[PDB]
Design a protein around this ligand. Structure first.
Ligand SMILES: [Ca+2]
Ligand SMILES: [Ca+2]
Ligand SMILES: [Ca+2]
Ligand SMILES: [Ca+2]
Ligand SMILES: [Ca+2]
Ligand SMILES: [Ca+2]
Lengths: 278, 278
């Protein structure tokens, strides 16, 4: 219900299209709305040529960086003329500076430049392996939004996808149980809780199977990702490393398994096969 | 004691407090002794600001985790400056990494950081984790040690408190007898021994009376906690499970009850009322 305002304009050297004079200094600060960057190009460029544009120049800077230093008419080995190149602001702001020195041996016409704001694509551009979203990144005008696959919920940090893996209440007495996505990497910032609740007088036995991969610390044990098992009379765990933990035999009919994950890592996780006797 | 690295120290960007240069890379690995962690903070911080600190940064890592990525002077929406924040190592080690890219358009002054070792308090958990001691936990500089309540003795594992429940010699003809702390959970790694010595020609009768709770096995009987009874003419037990066992009638004037517990469990235990006839 609220939309960005357009931002666009035209910049010229003093007196354009007539020849620019000596000892002139101009600067324009251009600012796009949040989520936008600026796009600038030159329809006309004809300045005094000099080594590294020491005499006359047009300087484009953005944020903390110098985007370009331009002079002459056609780009050389150590100088740059803009040609049909396009220049982009870093962030929403862009400064344009024009300077002429004490003399022009020829009648130089200066420059005509045009600029326009365009939406930043936070999902595709400024992207290496670093996607700002855990699952789905949605670009829109002036921003972006994150969403998650089914069976997840967006964390409060608005980027991480937390599994909905609590609430599983098993009553079938022989069965399997697992970390999310296994054997794919288990999700970040998740709190899983699995409850085996069956008839009284029965005793359960739990078995880890196949592969095991939980984030470990060099000299500490399991401070990051914590996998623990709980009978109403006793506690077991936490299990880490990359070796399948030994069998466990419970006295109780009701058992609770909890799996907690922290903000980082791509570890595969765990399987558990539980059986039964009297 | 003595350690190769000092209890306190100072790290600065190359050339501090003068402007740092381009294409610079530094890394310091700081390591405290076991039982200590490292605490690091910044007295001065002024780096080039960039989206996600891609240009210049200080990265604090510990173990496998990145504690922080820092740039700028004051923290923004997607960037972090340390301010007066304190950073803590996970375990005794902590790595500091400094990097600068190809240019500095302003005189960025870099950073001054200080670190100090501090004792880990193994006794004071956030207590979402377990307590390392059975009874009393004592913290000291560089370590901790355990102790027990009166009537107990510290087990060889230096953490578990074993009850002193041997030595009870009953001569009274009618009476009660019990697992330690009943009806509170009976202690771990304890070996209790109760001796009933009565006049010749008399016969004792034993009765479980209130609650009965001893660690049971799925398909076996009593391999963890073992409660056994011994007359000079017979042996009874071991008794486990969680149902009050039937009455027992001894021929002997002499009875010895032995109760053994394992390293884990919170089971309540047992009472026994014994009487006598001719
Ligand atoms: Ca000139
Ligand atoms: Ca956008
Ligand atoms: Ca993790
Ligand atoms: Ca830099
Ligand atoms: Ca300590
Ligand atoms: Ca026990």
């Amino acid at each position: 219900s609220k939309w960005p305002e357009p931002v666009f304009g035209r910049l010229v050297s003093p007196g354009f299209p007539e020849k620019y004079g000596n000892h002139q200094d101009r600067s324009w600060t251009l600012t796009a709305p949040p989520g936008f960057r600026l796009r600038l190009y030159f329809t006309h460029f004809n300045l005094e040529l000099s080594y590294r544009c020491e005499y006359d120049f047009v300087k484009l800077t953005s944020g903390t960086k110098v985007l370009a230093t331009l002079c002459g008419q056609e780009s050389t080995d150590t100088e740059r003329a803009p040609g049909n190149d396009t220049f982009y602001s870093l962030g929403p702001s862009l400064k344009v500076t024009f300077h002429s020195d004490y003399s022009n041996e020829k009648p130089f016409t200066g420059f005509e430049a045009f600029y326009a704001a365009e939406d930043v694509d936070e999902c595709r551009t400024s992207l290496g392996d670093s996607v700002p979203c855990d699952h789905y990144c949605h670009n829109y005008l002036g921003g972006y939004y994150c969403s998650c696959r089914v069976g997840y919920i967006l964390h409060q940090n608005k980027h991480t996808c937390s599994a909905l893996c609590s609430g599983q209440v098993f009553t079938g007495r022989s069965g399997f149980l697992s970390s999310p996505e296994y054997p794919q990497p288990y999700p970040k910032l998740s709190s899983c809780a699995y409850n085996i609740r069956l008839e009284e007088g029965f005793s359960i036995t739990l078995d880890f199977v196949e592969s095991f991969d939980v984030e470990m610390h060099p000299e500490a044990q399991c401070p990051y990702d914590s996998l623990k098992i709980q009978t109403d009379k006793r506690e077991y765990g936490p299990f880490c490393g990359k070796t399948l933990p030994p069998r466990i035999e419970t006295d109780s009919n009701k058992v609770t398994i909890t799996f907690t994950t922290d903000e980082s890592g791509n570890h595969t996780g765990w399987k558990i096969h539980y059986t039964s006797t009297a």
